[PDB]
Design a protein around this ligand. Structure first.
Ligand SMILES: *[C@@H]1O[C@H](CO)[C@@H](O[C@@H]2O[C@H](CO)[C@@H](O)[C@H](O)[C@H]2NC(C)=O)[C@H](O)[C@H]1NC(C)=O
Ligand SMILES: *[C@@H]1O[C@H](CO)[C@@H](O[C@@H]2O[C@H](CO)[C@@H](O)[C@H](O)[C@H]2NC(C)=O)[C@H](O)[C@H]1NC(C)=O
Ligand SMILES: *[C@@H]1O[C@H](CO)[C@@H](O[C@@H]2O[C@H](CO)[C@@H](O)[C@H](O)[C@H]2NC(C)=O)[C@H](O)[C@H]1NC(C)=O
Ligand SMILES: *[C@@H]1O[C@H](CO)[C@@H](O[C@@H]2O[C@H](CO)[C@@H](O)[C@H](O)[C@H]2NC(C)=O)[C@H](O)[C@H]1NC(C)=O
Ligand SMILES: *[C@@H]1O[C@H](CO)[C@@H](O[C@@H]2O[C@H](CO)[C@@H](O)[C@H](O)[C@H]2NC(C)=O)[C@H](O)[C@H]1NC(C)=O
Ligand SMILES: *[C@@H]1O[C@H](CO)[C@@H](O[C@@H]2O[C@H](CO)[C@@H](O)[C@H](O)[C@H]2NC(C)=O)[C@H](O)[C@H]1NC(C)=O
Ligand SMILES: *[C@@H]1O[C@H](CO)[C@@H](O[C@@H]2O[C@H](CO)[C@@H](O)[C@H](O)[C@H]2NC(C)=O)[C@H](O)[C@H]1NC(C)=O
Ligand SMILES: *[C@@H]1O[C@H](CO)[C@@H](O[C@@H]2O[C@H](CO)[C@@H](O)[C@H](O)[C@H]2NC(C)=O)[C@H](O)[C@H]1NC(C)=O
Ligand SMILES: *[C@@H]1O[C@H](CO)[C@@H](O[C@@H]2O[C@H](CO)[C@@H](O)[C@H](O)[C@H]2NC(C)=O)[C@H](O)[C@H]1NC(C)=O
Ligand SMILES: *[C@@H]1O[C@H](CO)[C@@H](O[C@@H]2O[C@H](CO)[C@@H](O)[C@H](O)[C@H]2NC(C)=O)[C@H](O)[C@H]1NC(C)=O
Ligand SMILES: *[C@@H]1O[C@H](CO)[C@@H](O[C@@H]2O[C@H](CO)[C@@H](O)[C@H](O)[C@H]2NC(C)=O)[C@H](O)[C@H]1NC(C)=O
Ligand SMILES: *[C@@H]1O[C@H](CO)[C@@H](O[C@@H]2O[C@H](CO)[C@@H](O)[C@H](O)[C@H]2NC(C)=O)[C@H](O)[C@H]1NC(C)=O
Ligand SMILES: *[C@@H]1O[C@H](CO)[C@@H](O)[C@H](O)[C@H]1NC(C)=O
Ligand SMILES: *[C@@H]1O[C@H](CO)[C@@H](O)[C@H](O)[C@H]1NC(C)=O
Ligand SMILES: *[C@@H]1O[C@H](CO)[C@@H](O)[C@H](O)[C@H]1NC(C)=O
Ligand SMILES: *[C@@H]1O[C@H](CO)[C@@H](O)[C@H](O)[C@H]1NC(C)=O
Ligand SMILES: *[C@@H]1O[C@H](CO)[C@@H](O)[C@H](O)[C@H]1NC(C)=O
Ligand SMILES: *[C@@H]1O[C@H](CO)[C@@H](O)[C@H](O)[C@H]1NC(C)=O
Ligand SMILES: [Ca+2]
Lengths: 467, 467, 467
């Protein structure tokens, strides 16, 4: 009978409706599929290169500013920090206390880029210190960025190999200790008391993080870093919550998730107890100063009125605040969900291979050293490698007794100098692209087959049943 | 005519049946698609860190136990191995002979963790030797695991950078050779005669493999290892033969394919000729001893009855067995298909970046050394760095003639000490997840469109043809 | 009415036609999906290993050939290059001038593999220099390839770890400078004046590129390179323009994109101004010689007729040509689109982890050195480490005054020797396979559902309308 026909048509209608609902719910689950493809002829951008000296403070600079009539704030601060008693003494002896309590005089204790960088060369063109930008850092105090995206437009690489990349001859400015003085190994820090250079190779125009993402370079070796470029392309809403925005910080930075988290930490500190930390990115918010500045410490020194008995305890509630919040943030990981930090939509990263070779050869030491002493200030009064130049000159101009002098000169030069080549190994860029797993066109195609037929069946059945 | 209608309907029926068969056969090919996604707010687990000393045997320990009245088994074994002749002498001089033929006395020749580890620190909290677990190893003899998942639950990381990770100051216990003795370079081993530390960073609770997966760390440098966590999630049956089981071995281990293969090798040796090898994982199966134990070698020494002429050949069939099977397994790769070893369903791995810096600076050497000699046994009678402390103390308390002493002290200290920081570079975890390429829901959706309509057509045709 | 029926059928026909067009256009967009799978039981091929000495020229060889009556071309060339004036003097002092202008005598200045390689061992079997193939290189002058795929078939690895891989003890042949001579640091090169070994680990039978893809190895350290194999499988047309061809060059090479680009550069130079460059792959095209050969420079030396006033300028238009085209190619990246260089269909790559340990230990130095001096020519007249052997022998046969000799011997030996182990960390191969995103079977299945039904509807409508 035709009732069987009607029931048997309506069951097919139900099946078609199930198909429609299933496909629509699949399209509303905005799945993504990633595919990796090698892009050639894509212009490669040379990364930003941040170099920091592992020894944050030059002791010889302190010694000769100690003899200077000028730089009185340094004498005041040192005598002040040794005359009293402070809770959290590990911070008072740190370099962050120097930075926070001596705003401008602290540049007289650090390393200047002219002292460090004795040779630069990019793409077979000579550098100077004129296209490095300096930033303050915690526990390194200064980090100099090449290709930071501020002085100049972004550099590009059109060749491979060490010749065409960046090449630096750096002197770590190691200093000879005085005969009777010795240092104290801070057994509560995992980074201090080394020599070398901390190098960060990061995406062009992004924020550096020398402590986390850097790698060390030892003196006396030519170290080469070969880079391979990678590009990650992500999808925005509704396929994901990635963003094209850029970080603000102290200067506009290209967006990276880690730097967003660091800025979130800084904002949380500022919100909670009205000061910012030196061990975190600077923000420059009004009415806010560093967590650890002791206001009027110069007045705290000088009892014009009867006050401040020696070995006193100076109350620093801001240090306790900042330390407590640091510990809470370091041991609890819940703030991350409360302050945004979406992933960047497009992100360039690098795969690096670092390798060492012995450098420089003895036969070429003297001439190299002749450059090093003929570039800087004509005041060669005293440097760690003056003895090296004297020994090498006395060898060249007029063999055991001179074997010791050659050995000592090489030992000094290789204790102080290093070379660093950063270059692109290949110009092919491996790109990981997100795609909509089930796009709108695919759904349109899958549905258009059943649309007309089944809503036609529905129209016919509805118009027949109405009578 | 209507015969054309019937034929033209049945051809569409055949086409629909082809579509059904094609989609069903595609769904029965259980294909998988992998996608990589960055998981944030996922708790990162600090890896297991296994450290081994590259010099397996301390010669000074042998020398002073040689002078001891106690430790007579050592004299017996040494005099025994030099008085006779053995086939495969490369094993008799090895450390595996020491381990196998002196079950407990062999702990008196190796390096103790208290001698090696002079400073540990995790997450800014002090360690001791109390949370390292010792395991025997071939060709290193001892490997100490931190975060092995047995003493404590798995550790977790909530911060990045060297400060918050594991930091170790290690002394490789280098020993000064005697004036008249020299060693013999075993030109038939590619690993011996080095100094440093072999480090393995492996998934938490998995089985270490120092020879294969380790990396060396040289003395006199602070070496930092920055880690990035990766997670691989695989699918079980019917999409693949991955498993959630765990390896048994000597102790329950988290499953890894390489360790399963090593256990398979050990089981094959045990099955074939009833002994196990030291160069492979221990199994502890009853009635089974090491391939290379010479039973009653103490009795073989002592001819109570007239026997054992000097320069005799002691028959060791077990060594020949184990060597022959080792060579067959190393040159033939067919056993792998016969002993299971499915891949683990979930597996965490790490990308590591290792870098060196010069350490420690001279200005901070003395104080550091003051710790090293003030931690261990009050018996400072003789150590490789006693001269270093003497020279540095004579420099500090009361400048060429002292320049040589400073140079020598630094040379010793940097020949013996090293520092190792292992930390997480980022807390984001890149996860590679398998997905069913063509799931059940997708098949249901693709088929439901044609199901009702075409089996309705089939029912109508069948009921019409029956008359 | 039935006109509504006809219109309502034809709209469904239009929808079905849209579905057909959409699916066909999707199938004509030959998309690909990549999936990564771990292949076990797949035979792993040991890579090709190219080693080059970083010091390209041994000065002692020049000195003693300078005293030889033979090798007169060297005296002629040296006296010629110092008597005149040349534009682009950085090339005349280079090693490429030596190579190009002294075709066969230049082998008397480089390093011979017998001088460098003092021990090889593969898969526990001894090597010789007999299965290394030598190739000329720019700025290294010689690169010796192991497992290059020419002398023998491709080697395979059936085991993991340092024991079963390749192990080399190499001497970098460092030479002691004369008391009164010193070198000139070429501050216009980023690679010169180092010591060590440049190692390239590349796909079996491919073309090496030591300057771009190599990594340095320092003397005095045992450096271990652990490799993990990766295989990339790409799709040919119509899914992509990958190829299965092989590069020609000077010898048949397995295809790699970078080597194709280098050969393209060489062909472009040859086309543009009829000479080839030494800093690029050799091609051996007829009527073509190196860009930088000065024809009849021996005749240019000797004015039989009154000519060639001293400090003359010798016109070398070929050098200017080759330099100008090099600069254009290095700063412009448009040639890449004009000379093919499709990606290879199948390509094996490696992930490498390099690590150092101190080597050799002092206790084992003498015996090691006893091998080194007892392998080479019985003429031990003068070598950089003769003093080391003398000191060690005088220590062993008959303790401060001997502490200096031990220290000096160790300093020499560790300045000259190094060890290199290259091995496979795991035998699992991670393969990235391309797949057709929407294959022919998938399209056939998606279309067969609608084919019969809707072209049946079309046939019925067409045959009804014709009357
Ligand atoms: C820090 O500075 C103060 C200010 O000069 C020093 O005080 C003087 O110390 C010297 C010698 O110790 C005395 O002769 C002066 O009379 C002191 N001046 C005053 C105003 O009392 C002080 O010694 C410095 N050092 C320390 C550790 O406090
Ligand atoms: C290094 O810094 C110098 C100093 O500015 C840069 O030299 C300038 O380059 C621009 C671009 O060609 C010129 O317009 C200026 O005239 C240059 N300044 C001077 C004083 O000559 C140089 O470009 C920087 N190097 C790199 C690689 O960015
Ligand atoms: C600054 O502080 C010191 C420490 O209190 C003062 O030294 C004491 O000063 C009082 C009052 O002048 C004397 O009675 C004590 O005998 C001093 N202590 C000594 C000498 O050990 C110092 O005078 C203060 N500076 C001033 C008041 O200008
Ligand atoms: C951006 O989107 C991702 C996922 O699309 C969010 O990640 C989730 O974060 C919560 C917070 O703990 C977790 O419980 C979920 O498991 C995460 N999902 C996944 C798939 O990992 C992320 O939170 C979003 N960003 C913000 C700022 O909310
Ligand atoms: C190994 O030990 C045996 C047992 O003591 C040594 O044999 C003694 O050797 C000394 C000197 O060579 C003789 O004076 C004794 O008479 C020996 N004892 C016996 C019981 O014969 C043997 O010398 C040791 N060394 C070697 C290489 O065999
Ligand atoms: C290092 O080993 C020590 C020794 O057990 C561990 O100290 C114990 O830690 C647990 C967990 O907090 C406490 O319940 C015990 O009371 C501790 N023992 C002692 C003697 O105090 C320590 O946790 C280990 N370090 C790490 C990082 O695991
Ligand atoms: C253990 O073995 C050695 C080697 O055979 C024995 O030395 C010989 O002993 C026999 C019998 O006592 C003598 O005839 C030989 O002259 C000995 N060889 C010499 C002295 O070179 C040794 O005596 C044995 N130990 C015993 C039997 O207690
Ligand atoms: C687990 O499954 C994999 C594939 O799903 C098996 O791998 C096959 O192993 C055989 C043995 O030589 C090879 O001939 C095949 O080519 C392999 N297949 C693939 C796709 O690589 C593996 O053997 C299985 N495990 C066990 C223990 O049988
Ligand atoms: C290069 O070789 C020529 C050829 O011998 C040298 O010319 C000779 O130089 C010596 C000393 O300078 C004179 O005594 C000879 O008379 C020269 N020979 C001729 C034929 O003139 C030349 O000195 C060498 N060196 C240089 C820098 O030109
Ligand atoms: C190193 O080179 C030698 C020299 O040819 C190779 O030895 C040959 O190996 C083949 C294959 O087994 C034999 O057929 C030849 O008879 C061997 N030659 C000699 C002179 O014995 C050796 O195989 C090479 N090593 C490696 C790992 O390829
Ligand atoms: C090769 O060239 C040199 C440089 O011109 C010649 O030296 C000059 O030769 C001419 C002609 O013989 C003399 O008049 C000059 O006085 C020479 N210059 C001096 C001595 O400084 C050299 O003679 C040429 N060789 C020949 C012609 O055989
Ligand atoms: C091989 O195919 C790829 C894409 O399938 C081609 O890559 C294109 O190259 C041109 C040349 O600049 C670019 O403008 C396009 O953007 C590239 N496409 C993609 C998707 O990246 C490549 O050119 C082809 N090979 C040759 C030799 O033509
Ligand atoms: C804080 O900022 C406001 C706005 O600029 C300013 O008026 C005020 O003076 C600041 N606070 C102090 C203590 O000066
Ligand atoms: C300063 O006081 C602390 C405790 O308050 C004490 O340990 C220290 O010895 C004192 N310093 C001097 C120089 O007395
Ligand atoms: C082997 O094991 C069995 C079972 O434990 C035991 O009875 C037997 O004694 C063992 N073999 C020997 C030789 O002792
Ligand atoms: C021991 O015997 C071997 C051969 O059996 C011989 O080479 C060696 O020289 C002998 N040792 C002594 C000390 O005679
Ligand atoms: C160039 O090659 C052709 C073909 O082999 C040859 O005949 C000719 O002689 C060559 N050119 C010169 C200058 O010899
Ligand atoms: C050679 O000529 C160049 C310039 O042409 C000049 O700089 C140089 O000093 C000359 N050499 C000698 C030895 O005179
Ligand atoms: Ca579909």
């Amino acid at each position: 009978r035709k009732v069987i026909w009607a029931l048997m048509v309506i069951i097919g209608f139900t099946a078609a409706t199930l198909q429609l609902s299933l496909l629509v719910r699949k399209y509303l689950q905005f799945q993504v599929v990633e595919l990796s493809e090698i892009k050639d002829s894509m212009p490669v951008e040379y990364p930003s290169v941040t170099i920091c000296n592992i020894e944050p403070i030059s002791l010889r600079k302190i010694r000769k500013a100690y003899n200077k009539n000028e730089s009185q704030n340094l004498k005041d601060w040192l005598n002040f920090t040794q005359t009293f008693h402070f809770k959290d003494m590990s911070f008072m002896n740190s370099i962050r206390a120097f930075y926070e309590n001596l705003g401008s005089d602290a540049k007289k204790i650090s390393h200047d880029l002219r002292d460090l960088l004795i040779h630069c060369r990019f793409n077979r063109e000579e550098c100077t210190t004129e296209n490095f930008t300096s930033s303050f850092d915690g526990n390194y105090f200064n980090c100099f960025t090449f290709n930071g995206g501020q002085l100049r437009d972004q550099l590009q690489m059109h060749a491979t190999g060490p010749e065409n990349g960046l090449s630096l001859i750096i002197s770590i400015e190691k200093d000879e200790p005085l005969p009777g003085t010795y240092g104290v190994y801070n057994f509560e820090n995992n980074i201090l008391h080394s020599a070398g250079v901390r190098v960060v190779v990061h995406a062009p125009g992004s924020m550096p993080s020398p402590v986390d993402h850097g790698f060390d370079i030892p003196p006396g070796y030519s170290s080469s870093v070969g880079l391979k470029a990678l590009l990650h392309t992500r999808l925005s809403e509704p396929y994901g919550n990635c963003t094209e925005d850029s970080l603000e910080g102290i200067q506009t930075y290209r967006n990276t998730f880690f730097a967003c988290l660091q800025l979130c930490k800084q904002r949380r500190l500022i919100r909670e107890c009205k000061c910012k930390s030196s061990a975190l990115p600077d923000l420059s918010v009004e009415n806010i100063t560093f967590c650890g500045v002791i206001p009027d410490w110069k007045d705290i020194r000088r009892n014009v009125t009867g006050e401040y008995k020696m070995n006193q305890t100076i109350p620093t509630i801001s240090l306790a605040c900042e330390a407590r919040v640091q510990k809470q943030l370091n041991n609890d990981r819940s703030y991350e969900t409360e302050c945004g930090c979406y992933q960047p939509c497009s992100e360039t990263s690098y795969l690096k291979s670092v390798s060492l070779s012995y450098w420089p050869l003895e036969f070429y030491q003297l001439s190299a050293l002749e450059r090093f002493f003929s570039q800087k200030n004509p005041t060669d009064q005293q440097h760690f490698m003056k003895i090296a130049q004297d020994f090498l000159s006395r060898l060249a101009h007029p063999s055991l007794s001179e074997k010791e002098m050659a050995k000592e000169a090489s030992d000094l030069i290789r204790q102080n100098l290093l070379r660093l080549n950063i270059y692109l190994e290949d110009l092919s860029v491996v790109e990981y692209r997100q795609l909509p797993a089930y796009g709108l066109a695919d759904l349109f195609a899958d549905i258009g087959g059943t649309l007309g037929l089944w809503m036609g069946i529905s129209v016919l059945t509805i118009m027949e049943l109405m009578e």
